[PDB]
Amino acid sequence: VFALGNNLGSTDGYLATHSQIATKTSKPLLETSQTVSVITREQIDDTASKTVQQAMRYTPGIFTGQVGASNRYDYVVMRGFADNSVDNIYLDGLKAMGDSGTFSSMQVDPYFLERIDVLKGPSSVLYGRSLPGGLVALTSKKPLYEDYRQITGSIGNMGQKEMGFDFSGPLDEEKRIAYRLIGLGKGSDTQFDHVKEERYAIAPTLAIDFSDDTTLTLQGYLQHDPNGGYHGGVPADGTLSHHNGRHISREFFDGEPSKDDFDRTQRMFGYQLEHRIDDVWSARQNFRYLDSDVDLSQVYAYGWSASEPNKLNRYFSGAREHLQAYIVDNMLQAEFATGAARHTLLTGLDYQRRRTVVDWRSGSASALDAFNPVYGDDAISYFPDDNHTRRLEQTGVYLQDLIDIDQWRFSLGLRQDWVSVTDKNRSTGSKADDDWEKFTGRIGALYLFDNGLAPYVSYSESFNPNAYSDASGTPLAPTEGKQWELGLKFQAPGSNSFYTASLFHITQENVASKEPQDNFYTSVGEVRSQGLELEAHTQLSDNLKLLGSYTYTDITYTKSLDGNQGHTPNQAPKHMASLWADYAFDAGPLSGLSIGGGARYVGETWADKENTLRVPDYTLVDARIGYDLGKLGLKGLDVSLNANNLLDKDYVASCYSLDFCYFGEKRNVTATVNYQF
């Protein structure tokens, strides 16, 4: 049992029944007055999703192409909110604790995950600092109480290789103590020349039941990325149009080898303490400590040469970053009735503390020819170094009541945050400080008809520290999100099908804004995003599965001083849609055989804020083939073949600006062997 901080429920194929992402306590999706999606392990495997970001490509209201084919960082753009998207990720109920002002953003490998939950819209009432589009919660694999061993091996195009193991089971005869150990070695060249991706990782977990009332789970996670793939972009000039010839830049071009490093080491440890005091009272403590090192050397293009026509100007970023982060969450929950109302009453206290020590380097590099490049001119003319020590502290006190009365399901939430942010410039000695407090609230109401139909309304709020400063150096007031949401959910009792529609209106306040010829940013900007998301999980035939999604997003700068008032942010398609299907045969000569595939539509988008050039829309096809060799007398050994972007479309996924456009991933072919015993 133990609802507190756990999803529970069941999962079948691609469909989960319950989640805790919106409640911090197990609640059926059908009875939750928020838009929640769950991506199961199976879905992650079936679509051959290599990253958390790619796992999200069949979920509505999420755009997955912020830096195109890059896999260095997880960019999950929700309801159109691309800024600070890298900070959307929670792991096991706790913020990842990276610093989106630095290069020190963490990445969790999907191999270690049981599920991915997605919460749309402002959600600070239970989490604190966060973005107005929503948040993502990763649930790691946990120790199983029966023996489970799996070895996995994979090989594909682009020099893709991966090997992993996954071992779990009990350690005593009474099954009160259990362990899990997951390992991973993997690598890939990219579609990009002179680029490499490489990762090694291990995660030990240990669960100990003390009594019927207490479980303690201890977790470690150690990950080393000696190479971080590609994190570059090139001008719209030679990608969305020709440049100086029919010359268009290849989907394979680079910056400078011999000065191309990205080394990221992540060391996490934590525990989850679950104690039931009563059938009424339960308590939980989630704790995670993170220590990471990032080392970066990157020469990159910035515009065309004014001198040499088919050459790009290049610049250099270098970084040595050490991040230390503590997060704890303390929860107390009472479940009780007051006459005809059932209350699930949660009070909590959470604490985040982060310290980032950064040494930044910058300079100018040699110009490079975009078509037919000559490498080896790696001399840099360095600019003044920039060294900082960044600190962030957040203390939150929150209270929630989930009230069930008759068919009504109500949600009431209140939270108070104290945030302290420091920036010491170690090059100049100057120190910026800022302390403030924010209240946030949420009210939700849902009606559960006994046919499985649930309409609902929700009001929700968020805040996030402002990335920009008055430029007098103090940070600006934190941004604020406010959402009204109307939704409809449907599950047919008994059916493994689930349908939802979500209508949303989000306002983001205090966004930084300035006149183009102004020095000082000011916090008077405003962004509004409204739209509709439709999502369907359909089961038929006992062996045909289906996923469908449609998204409409109207996001606008409703208030700006920069001359882009009324405009639509770049990287925000008005329309997206997807569909996936998987057919298995369980009887006949084709037994143990699986076939699946799907398609993904991303509407046209703006290349630039100033809305002067469009990035073409695109439709991509994914396919898979699998076979359980168990049917041939090889028990627990099965084989998969995957292909994403099957038609191998060469396209620009998105652009950060007219100077930085990103190529989508080329065809990815993958073949995997899994062995249980």
Ligand X SMILES: CCCCCCCCOCCOCCOCCOCCO
Cβ-contact 169, 676 below 8 angstroms? no
Q: How far is the CB of 310 from ligand X (least distance, A)?
A: 45
Q: Which is nearer to ligand BOG, 505 or 631 (CB)?
A: 505
Amino acid at 522: T
Q: How far is the CB of 457 from ligand X (least distance, A)?
A: 6
Q: How far is the CB of 532 from ligand BOG (least distance, A)?
A: 9
- 572 binding partner (options Na ion, ligand X, ligand BOG, none; Cβ < 5 to 8 Å by kind): Na ion
Cα 196 from Cα 198, distance rounded (Å) = 7
Binding region for ligand BOG (CB under 6 A) out of 89-97, 361-369, 478-486, 566-574: 478-486
Tokens of 260: 């191309």
Q: Which is nearer to ligand X, 486 or 623 (CB)?
A: 486
Question: Can you say how many angstroms the Cα of residue 27 is from the centroid of all Cα atoms in its chain?
Answer: 22
Q: Which is nearer to Na ion, 236 or 572 (CB)?
A: 572
Give the DSSP letter string of 532-588: EEEEEEEEETTTEEEEEEEEEEEEEEEE-SSS-TTPPPSS--SEEEEEEEEEEE-SS
Q: Which of 181, 283, 412, 503 binds ligand BOG (CB under 6 A)?
A: 503
Number of residues located near Na ion, criterion CB under 5 A = 4
Q: Is 192 in the site for Na ion (CB under 5 A)?
A: no
Q: Which is nearer to ligand BOG, 322 or 559 (CB)?
A: 559
Q: Is 504 in the site for ligand BOG (CB under 6 A)?
A: yes
Tokens of 651: 């396209």
Q: Is 438 in the site for ligand BOG (CB under 6 A)?
A: no
Q: How far is the CB of 445 from ligand X (least distance, A)?
A: 10
- 488 binding partner (options Na ion, ligand BOG, ligand X, none; Cβ < 5 to 8 Å by kind): ligand X
Cα 204 from Cα 143, distance rounded (Å) = 9
Q: Is 486 in the site for ligand BOG (CB under 6 A)?
A: yes
- 14 binding partner (options Na ion, ligand X, ligand BOG, none; Cβ < 5 to 8 Å by kind): none
Q: Is 455 in the site for ligand BOG (CB under 6 A)?
A: no
Binding region for ligand BOG (CB under 6 A) out of 84-92, 340-348, 479-487, 626-634: 479-487
- 484 binding partner (options Na ion, ligand X, ligand BOG, none; Cβ < 5 to 8 Å by kind): ligand BOG
Binding region for ligand X (CB under 6 A) out of 105-113, 272-280, 323-331, 483-491: 483-491
Q: Which of 151, 283, 486, 613 binds ligand X (CB under 6 A)?
A: 486
Q: Which is nearer to ligand BOG, 443 or 629 (CB)?
A: 443
Torsion over CA of 505, 507, 508 and 514, rounded to 10 degrees?
A: 120
Q: Which of 507, 538, 543, 565 binds ligand BOG (CB under 6 A)?
A: 507
Q: Which is nearer to ligand X, 38 or 501 (CB)?
A: 501
Give the DSSP letter string of 91-159: ETTEE----TTSS------GGGEEEEEEEES--HHHH-S--TTEEEEEEE----SS-EEEEEEEEESTT
Q: Which is nearer to Na ion, 485 or 608 (CB)?
A: 608
Cα 192 from Cα 207, distance rounded (Å) = 43
Cα 3 from Cα 281, distance rounded (Å) = 11
Give whole-number Cα distances, 115 to 10, 134, 651, in Å: 12, 17, 30
HEC per residue, 505-542: EEEEEEEEECCCCCCCCEEEEEEEEEEEEEEEEEEECC
Cα angle 507-89-30, degrees, rounded to a multiple of 5: 70
Binding region for ligand BOG (CB under 6 A) out of 120-128, 341-349, 373-381, 482-490: 482-490
Amino acid at 207: A
Q: Which of 484, 583, 585, 656 binds ligand BOG (CB under 6 A)?
A: 484
Q: Is 455 in the site for ligand X (CB under 6 A)?
A: yes
Amino acid at 163: M
- 605 binding partner (options Na ion, ligand BOG, ligand X, none; Cβ < 5 to 8 Å by kind): Na ion
Binding region for ligand BOG (CB under 6 A) out of 233-241, 326-334, 378-386, 481-489: 481-489
Q: Is 501 in the site for ligand X (CB under 6 A)?
A: yes
Q: Which is nearer to ligand BOG, 557 or 662 (CB)?
A: 557
Diameter over CA atoms, the chain: 81
Beta strands in 339-493 (DSSP E): 341-369, 381-382, 386-405, 408-425, 431-447, 453-464, 479-490
Q: Which of 106, 392, 572, 658 binds Na ion (CB under 5 A)?
A: 572
Site string for ligand X, 531-570 (x = CB under 6 A): ---x------------------------------------
Q: Which is nearer to ligand BOG, 8 or 486 (CB)?
A: 486
Cα 88 from Cα 429, distance rounded (Å) = 32
Beta strands in 234-340 (DSSP E): 260-276, 281-304, 311-338
Question: How many other C-beta atoms are found inside a 10 Å radius of the C-beta of residue 342?
Answer: 14
Q: How far is the CB of 313 from ligand BOG (least distance, A)?
A: 42
Overall residue count recorded for the chain in this entry: 677
Binding region for ligand X (CB under 6 A) out of 156-164, 250-258, 279-287, 484-492: 484-492
- 455 binding partner (options ligand BOG, Na ion, ligand X, none; Cβ < 5 to 8 Å by kind): ligand X
Binding region for Na ion (CB under 5 A) out of 133-141, 195-203, 478-486, 560-568: 560-568
Q: Is 488 in the site for ligand X (CB under 6 A)?
A: yes
Q: Which is nearer to ligand BOG, 240 or 443 (CB)?
A: 443
Cβ-contact 312, 370 below 8 angstroms? yes
Q: Which residues contact 224 (CB under 8 A, 6 or more apart)?
A: 199, 200, 201, 263, 264, 265, 266
Q: Which of 98, 128, 396, 487 binds ligand X (CB under 6 A)?
A: 487
Q: Which of 605, 640, 654, 670 binds Na ion (CB under 5 A)?
A: 605
Q: Which of 403, 432, 453, 503 binds ligand X (CB under 6 A)?
A: 503
Tokens of 13: 């194929």
- 487 binding partner (options ligand X, Na ion, ligand BOG, none; Cβ < 5 to 8 Å by kind): ligand X
Site string for ligand BOG, 523-542 (x = CB under 6 A): -------x------------
Work out the burial of residue 616: count CB atoms within 10 Å of its CB; fewer than 13 is exposed, 13-18 middle, 19 or more buried.
Answer: exposed
- 606 binding partner (options ligand BOG, Na ion, ligand X, none; Cβ < 5 to 8 Å by kind): Na ion
**Using only C-alpha atoms, what is the Rg of the chain?**
25
Question: How many other C-beta atoms are found inside a 10 Å radius of the C-beta of residue 430?
Answer: 10
Q: Is 302 in the site for ligand BOG (CB under 6 A)?
A: no
Cα 528 from Cα 522, distance rounded (Å) = 18
Give the DSSP letter string of 5-17: T---S-EETTEES
Interface positions with Na ion (CB under 5 A) = 568, 572, 605-606
Interface positions with ligand X (CB under 6 A) = 455, 486-488, 501, 503, 534
Interface positions with ligand BOG (CB under 6 A) = 459, 482, 484, 486, 503-505, 507, 530
